[PDB]
Amino acid sequence: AMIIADNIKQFHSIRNSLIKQQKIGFVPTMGALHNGHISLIKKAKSENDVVIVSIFVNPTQFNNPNDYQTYPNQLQQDIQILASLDVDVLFNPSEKDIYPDGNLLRIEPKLEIANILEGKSRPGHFSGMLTVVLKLLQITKPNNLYLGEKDYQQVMLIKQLVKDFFINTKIIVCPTQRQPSGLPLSSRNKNLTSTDIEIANKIYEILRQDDFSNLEELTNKINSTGAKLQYIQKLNNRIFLAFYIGKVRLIDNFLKETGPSC
């Protein structure tokens, strides 16, 4: 029963056939679905008459070509998961569907939250993300949008986006799903080798032991595991960090008081 729309034309037809009365929920993703994504879909199914999920590996938000080339890809498994969850529509457009004439008009964020942390570490990422989310919102026109708290800055930027361009959509932020160790679920973690996972687990044991009073020292404890910390910052009541293990880039954020708790 799941409808799979491989292109915009088909999708428009599908979208135009829904009555205003139906609550429409939307979950944007770049595929390679895990329990994090699934938690978002489950929330949206509990609150909407119609749930749409997108799968689109957005080229304009990849500041790193290798990251892009190696981004995990398993459409058939993804479809199987979405059908299992009774998702109503899968929108899985091509690049040319979303950027008919290339990336000519971009949303450019000019504010502090864009300039720090992920913004600083991934130049041009937030522009690409904001531009594709705006286009995906204009296409799907949902009542409700589901986002993970893991991408904390992304959440706050999309909130600003929906506010500034008068998009009549409610935003629902969902807690970060984690492994028992505390490591957040992430599609890139599929790229982690055997030993890398143990390293990731080392790090989260360190994080669950730490009071975050000495970031230089914690940085040193994290770097000794073999990982390479990119940044760690205490921002109000929340810790933000990002690091590499081998070629894999992992990010996280959590309440200082809780740690990456279960």
Ligand X SMILES: Nc1ncnc2c1ncn2[C@@H]1O[C@H](COP(=O)(O)O)[C@@H](O)[C@H]1O
Q: Which is nearer to a second copy, 138 or 223 (CB)?
A: 138
- Residue 154 touches ligand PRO, criterion: CB under 6 A: yes
31 is in an annotated binding site: yes
Q: What distance in Å separates the CA atoms of residue 147 and residue 137, rounded to the nearest whole number?
A: 13
In the sheet where 3-5 sits, what is the strand order? 3-5, 89-91, 50-55, 24-29, 144-148, 170-174
- What is the smallest separation between the CB atom of 129 and ligand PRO, expressed in angstroms? 6
- What is the smallest separation between the CB atom of 178 and ligand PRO, expressed in angstroms? 15
Q: Which is nearer to ligand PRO, 5 or 30 (CB)?
A: 30
- Residue 61 binds which one of a second copy, ligand X, ligand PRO, none, with CB within 5 to 8 A depending on kind? ligand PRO
- Residue 117 binds which one of a second copy, ligand X, ligand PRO, none, with CB within 5 to 8 A depending on kind? none
Near a second copy by CB under 8 A: residue from 73, 74, 143, 160: 160
DSSP assignment string, 135-194? HHHHHH--SEEEEETTSHHHHHHHHHHHHHTT---EEEEEPPPB-TTSPBP-GGGGG--H
Q: With contact defined as beta carbons under 8 Å apart, do 183 and 260 qualify? A: yes
Residues 120-179 that bind ligand X (CB under 6 A): 147-148, 150-151, 174, 176-177
Near ligand X by CB under 6 A: residue from 15, 37, 135, 249: 37
With tokens 């940044």, the residue in question is: 231
Phi, psi of 37 (to 5 degrees): -60, -40
Catalytic (active-site) positions: 37
- Residue 107 touches ligand X, criterion: CB under 6 A: no
Angle of helix 125-140 versus helix 152-164 axis, rounded to 10: 50
Contacts of 40 (CB under 8 A, 6+ apart): 27, 146, 147, 148, 174
Q: With contact defined as beta carbons under 8 Å apart, do 142 and 24 qualify? A: yes
**What separation in angstroms does the CA of 140 have from each of 66, 210, 253, 254?**
30, 43, 29, 31
Near ligand X by CB under 6 A: residue from 140, 153, 186, 189: 186
Cβ atoms within 10 Å of 198's Cβ, excluding its own = 15
- Residue 167 binds which one of ligand X, ligand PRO, a second copy, none, with CB within 5 to 8 A depending on kind? a second copy
- What is the smallest separation between the CB atom of 146 and ligand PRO, expressed in angstroms? 13
Q: What distance in Å separates the CA atoms of residue 35 and residue 148, rounded to the nearest whole number?
A: 11
- Residue 129 touches a second copy, criterion: CB under 8 A: no
2 is in an annotated binding site: no
- Residue 253 touches ligand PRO, criterion: CB under 6 A: no
Q: What distance in Å separates the CA atoms of residue 179 and residue 181, rounded to the nearest whole number?
A: 5
Residues engaged in binding ligand X (CB under 6 A): 29-30, 36-37, 39-40, 147-148, 150-151, 174, 176-177, 184-187
Residue set of the binding site: 30-37, 61, 148-151, 154, 185-188
Residues engaged in binding a second copy (CB under 8 A): 8, 99-101, 103-111, 127, 130, 134-135, 138-139, 160-161, 163-167
Residues engaged in binding ligand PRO (CB under 6 A): 30, 61, 129, 151, 154
